[PDB]
């Protein structure tokens, strides 16, 4: 269990505004949707039975809710769920930074990126999202309850973009989906 804590991801940022009042209009409009136990649940974005098969398990239109009734309300296709401008420091990686709240036994955590000129208006789809993840992480560390992981960030792209981040655990077949809204520097 666990969710990115930097950037937040999109979960974890709605119920950090708080699941009773939502301010953004994307948090007010995924709890209309699917109500405030999605976000209580924040930590619980997950396939039992992944088992580095993603898309047998999250469909289409649903990676960011896992394809799970739960957290359907994730799904919502708008421009407005609230983003992060990241950028890489001087080293030209970047520090994710993801609140493990049940730490596992990890196989890896991989990053995947929106396409070039992704409309968010259009559901998500693994399609959407380069074949390849851009880092792929196989040793992390925990720390204070974290996994603290430089990634490079993928190169030339620009703009409000989906960073699409899989925890597969090597203990178990157990996987957990992390949509991270971010922007890109020209
Ligand atoms: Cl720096």
């Not at 949707?33 to 398990?57: C, R």
């Amino acid at each position: 269990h666990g969710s990115m804590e930097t950037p937040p991801s999109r979960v974890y940022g709605c119920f950090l505004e708080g699941p009773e009042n939502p301010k953004s209009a994307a948090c007010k409009a995924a709890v209309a949707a699917g109500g405030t136990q999605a976000l209580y649940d924040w930590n619980g974005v997950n396939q039992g039975n992944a088992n580095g098969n993603h898309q047998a398990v999250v469909p289409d239109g649903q990676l960011c809710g896992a394809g799970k009734a739960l957290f359907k309300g994730l799904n919502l296709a708008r421009s407005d769920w609230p983003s992060t401008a990241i950028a890489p420091d001087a080293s030209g990686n970047f520090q994710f930074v993801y609140k493990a709240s049940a730490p596992h036994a990890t196989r890896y955590f991989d990053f995947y990126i929106t396409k070039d000129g992704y409309n968010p208006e259009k559901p998500l789809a693994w399609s959407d999202l380069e074949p390849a993840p851009f880092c792929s992480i196989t040793s992390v560390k925990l720390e204070n309850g974290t996994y603290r992981m430089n990634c490079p960030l993928p190169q030339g792209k620009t703009g409000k973009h989906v960073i699409y981040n899989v925890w597969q655990r090597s203990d178990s077949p157990e996987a957990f989906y992390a949509c991270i809204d971010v922007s890109f520097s020209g």
